[PDB]
Symmetry: C3
């Protein structure tokens, strides 16, 4: 609730109502709590690339008067050995087991980004890495996208849907789209997780074989007919993700371009808004025209990433010992 010790799943945010309250409070008065994080240091660690999370999170920290240190492992640091009990006589000069505690020594709050490795479903879904940070960093840890979730993103999506909805409980449809490379299911999982927490009419549509883990799908409606799902929707949340079930974990089952959210599908919606977490591959995930259309709130959405981050960062600060 109001005792945030970490930020990885929607549960951590507590009551959505009051969470959204603070969100809009801050949208209105961006530097209202610029004094709260004074002399508090945030350490942002990146195991993967990032534009939005990278930029938005620093800004957020600044809104709170915090200190920010961005660390891109692999670049300026030493490669990390993730497995325990191995003889470190090669590629890796340092072991994750030392790295984590050490990083925790120089900051107050930690943000981590560690994409699913798609080498072993269990390792990814048990969220081994993000958890080792939680266990051994000795600091509050918030996700900048783990192997199976991306709360900071979803929380922002929530904020923008509330921000733009025309009715109390809109029809929000998350749709799969073709992509050339195998992507994590973190965003979809996370979106579903958050949408299920609302009372919106949530629908998930994807090709056969791309079923997401039940624990995330929840009791949301799954429609295999994209056109049917889109019917009368108020929000379209497009995002690609590699397979998850059985022998296809982390694999591309298809690149059926008929799923590319184009003008054809949008037409069937109730003049719905188009959303996407970004990056977005144009004419793969969505048409140039759709993303450029006025119903596309892609940027406003991205912008809200600063808010969700400022709210989470604030809560974390408020709970620092």
């Amino acid at each position: 609730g109001s005792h945030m010790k970490k930020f990885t799943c929607v549960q951590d945010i507590g009551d959505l109502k009051s969470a959204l309250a603070e969100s809009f409070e801050i949208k209105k008065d961006r530097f209202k709590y610029v004094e709260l994080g004074r002399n508090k240091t945030l350490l942002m660690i990146f195991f993967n690339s990032s534009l939005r999370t990278r930029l938005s999170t620093q800004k957020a920290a600044l809104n709170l008067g915090m200190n920010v240190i961005v660390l891109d492992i692999n670049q300026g640091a030493w490669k990390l050995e993730t497995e325990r009990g191995v003889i470190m006589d090669g590629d890796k000069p340092e072991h994750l087991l030392e790295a984590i505690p050490v990083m925790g020594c120089y900051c107050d709050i930690i943000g981590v980004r560690s994409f699913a490795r798609f080498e072993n479903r269990e390792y990814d879904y048990n969220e081994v890495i993000i958890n080792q940070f939680i266990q051994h960093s000795g600091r509050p840890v918030f996700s900048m996208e783990a192997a199976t979730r991306h709360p900071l993103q979803s929380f922002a999506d929530l904020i923008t849907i509330e921000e733009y909805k025309k009715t109390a409980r809109p029809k929000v449809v998350m749709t799969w789209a073709p992509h050339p490379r195998p992507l994590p299911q973190a965003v979809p999982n996370s979106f579903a997780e958050w949408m299920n927490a609302t009372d919106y009419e949530f629908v998930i549509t994807h090709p056969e074989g791309y079923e997401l883990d039940p624990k995330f799908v929840g009791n949301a409606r799954v429609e295999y007919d994209q056109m049917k799902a889109f019917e009368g929707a108020d929000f379209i949340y497009a995002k690609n993700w590699a397979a998850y079930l059985g022998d296809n974990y982390g694999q591309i089952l298809s690149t059926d371009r008929n799923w590319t959210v184009g003008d054809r599908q949008m037409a069937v919606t109730n003049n719905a808004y188009f959303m996407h977490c970004l990056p977005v591959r144009r004419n793969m995930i969505v048409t140039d025209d759709v993303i450029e259309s006025p119903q596309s709130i892609v940027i406003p959405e991205a912008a809200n990433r600063e808010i969700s981050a400022t709210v989470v960062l604030k809560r974390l600060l408020e709970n620092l010992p």
Copy 2:
């Protein structure tokens, strides 16, 4: 004094008062440290940089600003620059989304985007730097675009004023041999600014290396290096790849007789040696010349902090 961007000498307005603030700040570096409080500067790099990279952060700090340095390609996603393509490859993100997005998290934007030498029009129409101006939603200042480098030139002006022995010195910009094809942004920019002064400006380069007229202006072009150097008070050496006709962005020569050495300096009125840096020793200039006491290369570089602080200040002062 309502600066909305900073890409060409026009943006600075009256040079006199611009130089005034420059020296004001040289004297009292943190005089306006309170001005940029709670204002965030986003520096974006599409190319390498030491001086611009360092000097601009310091400048922002002098104004009490927040600074975020972003090196695309490194921590971010590769950008697709062309519109209407099917992004099914190398690029995960399109510039059309990237720009607006970056603008979302800052108050002022600084961009560095070297000429790509793939198409003269694309470069000279300054497509990229302009798309930032058009879609970032924030004031944009150049950290060197395809055809200009105001921050650098403005600094060169400051140092010439700072060191000149007479009111209107003879400033000679000279080409020099280089192993790789370099943009003409620095030369173009220097010429642009020198033409704005009332100094005796002269441009000297090998045949074929003529810069665009709009930049050359009505400056004197001398193809005989030794003749140009005669009695000069300032030597501004810099290499640049060809520009005209079928040689856009190409190396026409590496004639080492142009390497600014002791031979040419001797003919000048004990002139100062200047260069924006990086500089390849014994290519652009002799070890001895750059190391000589007439070489104000560092003082020059140092002034990059001032030009940046002045520009950054003006931009802040005009923020809504």
Copy 3:
């Protein structure tokens, strides 16, 4: 002592007693001097990789209210030509002779990391690069590990030994350990240098051939029998380093795994603490069990890097013109 103009060797710190005093003063009140470095800018330059020095030094600077700019040459900047009088018609666009002065132009204090290049002993041991910074930067320079020393690290090791010792003058044993790659002798040299400055019972143990330079070894006891050296020790400081003498400068003479600090050797010590500057290759330098044992103060040690840096940075500030 209160006239710090640089920080590269133990001499620069002055009286160890008062140095340790400030150290613990700051451990207790971390932001006590947060106002001292206001409007002062620190420039950290890296010619090599780093996690601890990279992170700990920024935090330190922040504790002093300073401004921090981290520069990783090679990455965002232009490759530097280190030799003078060459015709720069190749790989290098910029020369070190211009780079150094230029970097000094935009900051108040400079921190440099430049590992030994192992291309020429004299060049390394005369500390040419670190010195050129001192000579031409025009600013106070502190080492983030040069070719032959690493004061920031050693000073921290001192702090932690003082912090954990059970007696006034403990037996501290620095031990060599097998490694797959040729490492600088900067850490060993530096540790010896500092331990020789104390009145602890200092012992150095390494295989034949790995003798460190006399000027660093000082009059410390050198034991070629690891097990003998470990006997009754109170602190074990393990660290690998490539050869130094004669025709083997910067070369791996052996990878004898019998030196891997394991449970076998620890047993012979007076239940000694295990220390290491990190990065550490597990099961090469030290056993998983040893480093994970409770006698392992590896992290507390790393943590102290923030203190040593804050103290040094403070002293430097206090002496700024």
